[PDB]
Symmetry: D2
Subunit: 405 residues, 4 copies
Amino acid sequence: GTPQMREIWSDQNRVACYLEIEAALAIVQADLGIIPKNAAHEIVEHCRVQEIDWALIYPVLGIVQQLVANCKDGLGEYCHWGATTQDITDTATVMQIRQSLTLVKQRLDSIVSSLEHLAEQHRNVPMAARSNLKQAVPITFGFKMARFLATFRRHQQRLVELEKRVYTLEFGGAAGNLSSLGDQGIATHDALAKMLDLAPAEIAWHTEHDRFAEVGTFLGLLTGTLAKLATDIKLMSQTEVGEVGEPSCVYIHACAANVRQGAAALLDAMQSDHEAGTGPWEIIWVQLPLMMNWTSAALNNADFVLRGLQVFPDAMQHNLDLSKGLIVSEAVMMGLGNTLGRQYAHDAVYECCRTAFVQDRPLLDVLLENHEIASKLDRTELEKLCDPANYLGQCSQWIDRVLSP
Amino acid sequence: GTPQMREIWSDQNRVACYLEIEAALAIVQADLGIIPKNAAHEIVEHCRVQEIDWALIYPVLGIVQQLVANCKDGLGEYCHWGATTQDITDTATVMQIRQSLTLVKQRLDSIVSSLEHLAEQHRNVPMAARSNLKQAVPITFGFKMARFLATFRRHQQRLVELEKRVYTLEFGGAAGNLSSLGDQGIATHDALAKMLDLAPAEIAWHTEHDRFAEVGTFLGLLTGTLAKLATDIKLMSQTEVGEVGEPSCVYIHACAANVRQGAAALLDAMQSDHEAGTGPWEIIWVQLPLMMNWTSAALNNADFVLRGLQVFPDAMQHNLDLSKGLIVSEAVMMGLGNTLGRQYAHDAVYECCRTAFVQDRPLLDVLLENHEIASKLDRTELEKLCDPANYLGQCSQWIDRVLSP
Amino acid sequence: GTPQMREIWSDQNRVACYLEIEAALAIVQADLGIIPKNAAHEIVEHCRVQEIDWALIYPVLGIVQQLVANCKDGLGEYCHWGATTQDITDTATVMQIRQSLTLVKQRLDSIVSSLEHLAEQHRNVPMAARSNLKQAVPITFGFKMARFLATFRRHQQRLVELEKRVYTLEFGGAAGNLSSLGDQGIATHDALAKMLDLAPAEIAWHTEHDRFAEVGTFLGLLTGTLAKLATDIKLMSQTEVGEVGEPSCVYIHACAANVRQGAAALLDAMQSDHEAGTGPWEIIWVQLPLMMNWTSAALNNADFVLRGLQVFPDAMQHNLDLSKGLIVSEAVMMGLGNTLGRQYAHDAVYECCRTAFVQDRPLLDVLLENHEIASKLDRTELEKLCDPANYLGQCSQWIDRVLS
Amino acid sequence: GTPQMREIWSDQNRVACYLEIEAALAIVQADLGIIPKNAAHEIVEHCRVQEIDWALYKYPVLGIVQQLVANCKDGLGEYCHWGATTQDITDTATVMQIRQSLTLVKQRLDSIVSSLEHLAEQHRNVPMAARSNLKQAVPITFGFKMARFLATFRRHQQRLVELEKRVYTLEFGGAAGNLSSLGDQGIATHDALAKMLDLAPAEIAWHTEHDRFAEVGTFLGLLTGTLAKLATDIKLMSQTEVGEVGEPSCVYIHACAANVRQGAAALLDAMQSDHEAGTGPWEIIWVQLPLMMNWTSAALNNADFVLRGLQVFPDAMQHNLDLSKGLIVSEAVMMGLGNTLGRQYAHDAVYECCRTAFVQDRPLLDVLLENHEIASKLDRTELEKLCDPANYLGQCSQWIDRVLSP
Ligand SMILES: O=C([O-])/C=C(\CC(=O)[O-])C(=O)[O-]
């Protein structure tokens, strides 16, 4: 992961969420009259990570013991009231997921910016579109970048839409009903949710892992797009192609591949049992932080390579001419269809292409060896049809469509 | 799959969308003056599946040949103009995905309806909350049904949000620029999108398999919940438990397992290359129809079992009382906490619990053999504290919260 | 899938395994005196798929009913004795898995044969080795084919080793103990295994899905190699590369991608419960035939493309020269190290390479513009060092190692 | 993971294998006359992990070989790593770690097979209800259940041995697998190093093959799969409403099985590498393999422990067996009466007694005795004996004997 993301899921930050949740709970339950105000005043005072000794099997109760034994007069005996261990972790993860998606939103912003710039800069730079790694028809490199831009924006919408579901609180107690809090449970839950800038929960979700999984599936979709970017780039940076040059993409392949399988594990964890299951919880506890760190590795590399990406229009022009005009045969067909018969127009270029291909000669040269062509049309305009730059299509217009929203 | 969903993705339905797309294109392209007005009239006339010989090998061009060779006066030379094969296939898939989500939305209503009824009907039927298949604390069966209900509503929200991205058109030609349509390309695209009640595409997406993948990951989340439901039922319908009864769930388990792995394939297909690529398309071409029919099988079984679910509160009573009050030991702790110290109360019930556990005797009897207990509290309320039905917490209240929005 | 493999898993063939299994059971149990000789003698007579109404919820009991009701004198009441439905399906699958692996073994022979031919034929054809899609150092195309050959041979060993575990019988009744057969259960089971040329089972495996899953994971490894091959080919057949030509590979990508994810489903199906479980079983019932048909599609395409593969040595030479000799800079260093100083040799060619690269000029041209170089050795052999075709290494010998 | 397995894949162990590989290469390459004999003595002497400053470098191997060359006097360190590429060191070192890891797996599997062998015998005759789809089916013994696992864990052991002969191979091919810089001594150096490291020589390079590592991965997937079924059955049998067994931990094995299998899929995906060398596919293996090894060891440790200390309560199995009040052994009653009254007629009649005994929640014996045809053609002493689950156990001790003989 990246130093930014690798600390979000570090212990130091994690147990910080722990102390931040316990303090808010103490405040909430004091205001509701569940615990003494002065005990709460002391619980919160010692909820500072700077004051925790890192002793070397319980992730949360290990902290609340160092907090209970660190409060004067045994006032620390009043924290963690009515809350279960999973409540602290799940809500803490939710807090961490938000911190992570802030970076993702920031990296996505930069990536969309870089793409917007490249789509404009190379708006009209011609190149060969490739289908199954074979050349197809002429397009512009800015058109290629525009197709990515439209994708990352869809991913941006996906991220925003899931935030309103994921940013929920997890405070349901042992069986999700908060028995030991009696009737103050729902009062405490909604109080804590407002305290933590989280949405109140409709009902407990200690075994309903749909929220966390949605994050995984999004990370999988996003990394998937980032992988296509690295594939096209490293393809275009081939020794034999050289249409672009990196300023780092090969790493995105591992991130996306690990992330997609990780998301599948999270979908498996959705098949939890009853009100609590250690197994499924453990799966999320393991994959989710990894998936966050893989995706940040991908976004960072992707952001960098685009910001410093080198584009070589000369190489793109050269590759377009490998076909010696064959690539724009469709243009020659439609162009010549006016002077010669439409039926003959197709039948002549089509046959002239086979000749020029088996003979590895320019299409223009085989067209001019047909007498009707050489007689009813001259070289200057016959060449203009065989120019790949003339069959660029209506791309710049599409590029504008993507840059308008 | 189910007969309802297997006809959406049947061959007959597919070639039906093909012919419906070709007709709309002929209309649109005539209206723009791209093709002859009378030629379109005959193209549309032969866009009836009833007129196609199932000689079966090409997916689209096998049909467009039967349409061209079926149009008199050589008018069939004008269909499929400027469109590539994937344009027809993907757009048809988009159409089929919508029909499929029509069924999914309806089954989700039946499933959400059933849960609302069960959440109320069994609102107060008590039962033992289970953590790791071990008993924990008492809750009500209606509380369990609400937790599923609240989830399926989230899945419904997710379904709607992706519809606005999925219901897009795919008409970009060979490289997404619609070269052969010249300056009429974007005009034709938006026209066809309006013709087919689809949103127009910002830019081509022949290798941007994010939309279809979005569908896949959704089916994974949705089936994930349907899988947890089937687990809880068949667990609660165990011979040794018998708390519920089916009217069939075991099949849902396989669906969830296949759909999640299929989704992983779709995320893999997202790493497509350049402008067009067979294979990534093939993965989707195979998985999506398979995944749709598995999910429909799951929704059908889930829908049916819920409408006919047998709930036996007596079994929940029997299993709940097996602990002889141990399950509601926490209640006894808090009760004596008023007369005696709260902390001191807990240390005593736990010790009273060890005895009743080693002696396999009711906790109430072990409470009464401690004299200090019998002196600071009488049998009538110690019986009332050891009653599991009294330590349910604010469940009916949580149940109400899920039933409001 | 392919017509050869797609009929192995067709209904016609499946219920044929059903009817062949039931007959052997009637013979064995009659032979053991469990059922009458004449009932078995007649039950087997009606175990012909041609006599089953294909117009038809239960996969096996639907067939065994057409046999019970089709036997004269009600003699058909003696078939399916003591056996559970899963016994018939699982044993039938095992029989089908064997038939499928027969095709796979043949495809591997053809593919390994083609590779042996290609590795020898193009033993010395030089080409550019590629690392991260960038050129690295010269190797021969036969050397590339040998690396595949060594792998497909490993896959062959894997196939044979699992065969001794997979070709087992599944006859355990309801709980794997064959209660209703009493003490003749083990007698009947072991008899049936020999009847069907299967190994008898140590104990029941109605929920012990290690065998079927192992098949899946092997299919995963095999298609894994087939996928790399298709990628290398289509990379080498790019418009801008043109080192080879297909006679079709893009399908292998989907096959491998489905088979690899399918295998995970089977690994999930291993988490079965207790003595029998629908669902975990269902996963295998669905994935196994699909993965078998994808793998045959991949093997089929791969076998054909290798037999008809076009190799263009001229294109391979052209790509090697793109670097203008830089690709064999390591060769120039070690060669010149004797005439010049070893340390200087490295320090000088290294600097000349940076120049020739930033200047997009031949390395030989920059080497001769160094005065010491031009003075202590002449162009005839300086050209000889810059030739990529001379720095191939021990490829032909390595190729010999793979061909044994 | 476990301290032993968490230590095999620790950095200290990894950089230790690097130095052991570098030393063996220097010895071999001096012995072949490729490098100076005196230079090797300086390379080997400074191949001690105690002499490495843990100044992390973000190159995995060259960060060490730079500290090894710069730590050798007389510029004699210029001769290490000759003709070897970075992946050569990592892959060969990984092979070494896989061997140490598979050493632990073999030991833990022995303990597990031993425990099961003992439980299968001890509880050979302990009756219990076979369960199909979590519903009761017919009576079996706990030893039969434990033996079915035993037969599987033995199969897993055979699989491990078969893959070792392929995995324990060397990785020495240079940049493209041709060992250009070693000239004609390349194949000589490779085969020498393989013997030096007690590894099999490689037929040809495998920098982009990944068939070996994937085989290991899929194996860990199969193994953890079985460990997952075991963890399910125990906690299923330790359920509050069941109580047939008791743990002394199984819920953790469930996550390992789920994580290892999806990791295995990643390793199969990494097989689609390109040409002669490729980062990414290598990275996938670099990340998943150590994770999968430590997940699998965690499972094996928990599984081994719970099996040695598994508490079995035969009374609970008896208690659950009688919940059906004889219906569970209804097939037995049919075959008994099938002799006097006829097989076909017996089932068609006993089934009706089952519907009654169930609808009335009365013992099957009681409804059987109220039918006169039964009461007249069969006596209470054996009608009671037929409805006893312990009498319809079938051949189990024999199957257990079959599994325990090899
Ligand atoms: O640098 C490394 O440790 C390994 C590499 C780099 C590469 O791909 O060139 C590999 O996996 O081959």
